[PDB]
Design a protein around this ligand. Sequence first.
Ligand SMILES: CC(C)(C)c1ccccc1NC(=O)N1CCC[C@H](C(N)=O)C1
Ligand SMILES: [Zn+2]
Length: 140
Amino acid sequence: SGAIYVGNYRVVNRHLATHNDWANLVWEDSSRDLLVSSTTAQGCDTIARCDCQTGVYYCSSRRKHYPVSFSKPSLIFVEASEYYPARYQSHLMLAVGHSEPGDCGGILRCQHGVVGIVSTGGNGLVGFADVRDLLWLDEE
Ligand SMILES: CC(C)(C)c1ccccc1NC(=O)N1CCC[C@H](C(N)=O)C1
Ligand SMILES: [Zn+2]
């Protein structure tokens, strides 16, 4: 589990969104595994607006933050799961790192701010849903 809290927005994995998230919906995209809901309190996270391909992510199944090198956002095949049919997931970045299903939502960050959240895993790989192109998260 986990979320990004920027401005009056809460950014979560679409597959882990709550009923309250759906009842306060701002935007959602199944192809990216992202959902954004509105919040009453202002958040403290800032979004990175950069070209970094190195950073640090939080792994809840180890209670540890790991440095990683990750690929640029791309269209990657994600096999059918308990949450989606077999499809291509867009804006996904891959790295070598530990992950388990419950690790989804952990933040990936660089020196500029939050880059994305854990969205896929298994086999010693971890995939992150990029949020750096979502410029509207910085306003309203
Ligand atoms: C062993 C699995 C379950 C693959 C796994 C292991 C470790 C971490 C996560 C996951 N889960 C996963 O990658 N899925 C299921 C949830 C939705 C994901 C998506 N964005 O389409 C794809
Ligand atoms: Zn950066």
